[PDB]
Structures are given as structure tokens and as C-alpha cells.
């Protein structure tokens, strides 16, 4: 459902976004540490702007800069529920848990669910881990694979399971086109 470009550089990232826009991709996302870079992604056809911050102080300023800019949909990646609560404040629409540890990740999800966070997302290589994140209150299940053929099967399994919203992270529009085909 959501195709997430993980760019090598500005130029290559924009080329993938443009190719997904050309393909007729429905919901395109782009990951960067920088509001300025994200603004050039939104132009090329990205619907979701994902802040992946160096540190939390720096991350929240990029969210306030995209909020001032009038970005349609802002997402924030963090290991911590506490950082994501404050990311939401500055106007992050989607709070993305990128955990060190499965056990810890799911507790981050439960904590956000208690606080009544707007939209919760969870990144994992594993459909089985994402099923459990969903149980704990994740709305968006993000497949971040170790390899392509393996990634696309995890998408097909989350489709069979019945996920609200499936996302996939790739460097490659070619990979993202097949992930969309898979659900």
C-alpha cells in the first residue's frame, strides 16, 4: 500500500520517486534526516515525508520546518515511545517504531497505544513480528527486508493475515513495484 524510498543520495532518491510516480504508484514515501531534502521529494511525487533524525533535538526541528512548509503527511522514525510522543507534538502524523529488540519494540507500541498516539507504525524484516506489533496496536506494518524475494513473501503473508496498511522499504523502484503487486 505505501512504497518507501530509502535513498542512496538526493539524485538517485528523486529518480526512484519519479519512476514510482510514472508507474502510477498510489502512496510514495521518502526517508531523510533533512526537511530541505524532503521538500524536493514531495515535489517529485512523495505523499509521506519520513524524518529519520541524527538525534532527537535535531529531528524535532526538521518536523517543525516541514509543519511550517505545509507538508501533507509527516512521519518520524525512533526507537523510543517518549521521542515519538514529542515528535507528534511538533506535528508528526505517523509515529514509526524502529526497535533494537523485538521484545522492546512491542512495549514501545503498547506505550504509544496507551498514550493514544495518532498513527503507529512498526518496522521489521518478519511478517510474524509485524503480526504481534499489529496485535499491540500498530496500524502500519512496514516490511524492511534482508533480501527482495524474501521481502515480497512477507508482504504476501501480511496480505493473507489482513493488515490495515502494509508498507515496504527499498532503494529500488523496481522492488517497490513488485511489493505493491504483492499488497
Author numbering: 1 to 183
Q: What's the paper's own text on this?
A:
Here, we investigate the capability of a deep neural network model to automate design of sequences onto protein backbones, having learned directly from crystal structure data and without any human-specified priors. To assess whether the model could perform sequence design for de novo structures, we tested our method on a Rosetta-generated four-fold symmetric de novo TIM-barrel backbone, a (βαβα)4 topology consisting of an eight-stranded barrel surrounded by eight alpha helices. We had the model fully redesign 50 four-fold symmetric sequences for the backbone and selected 8 designs for further characterization based on ranking by the model PLL and other metrics (see “Methods” section), using no information about previously confirmed sequences. Of these 8 designs, 4 are cooperatively folded proteins, as indicated by circular dichroism (CD) wavelength scans and by the presence of clear two-state transitions in thermal melt curves.
We successfully crystallized 2 model designs, F2C (1.46 Å resolution) and F15C (1.9 Å resolution), and the crystal structures validate that the sequences indeed fold into the TIM-barrel structure in agreement with the designed backbone. F15C adopts the full TIM-barrel fold, but for two of four monomers in the asymmetric unit of F15C, one of the β-α loops shifts to interact with an adjacent monomer in the crystal. However, we note that F15C primarily elutes as a monomer in size exclusion chromatography, and the interactions observed in the crystal structure resemble crystal packing, rather than a stable dimer interface. For F2C, the model uses an isoleucine to wedge between the long and short helices and forming a Tyr-Glu-Ser polar network that extends to coordinate the loop from the beta-sheet to the short helix; for F15C, the model has a different solution, designing phenylalanine and valine residues (F10, V14) to pack the long helix against the shorter one near the top of the barrel. Particularly interesting are the Tyr-backbone contact and the His-Glu-backbone polar network for F2C and F15C, respectively, that help coordinate the helices across symmetric subunits at the base of the structure; these are the only hydrogen bonding solutions designed at this position among all previous structure-confirmed sequences for this scaffold. All of the folded proteins designed by our model have higher thermal stability than the initial designs reported in the original study, with melting temperatures for 3 of the 4 ranging between 84 and 87 °C while the fourth protein (F5C) remains folded at 95 °C.
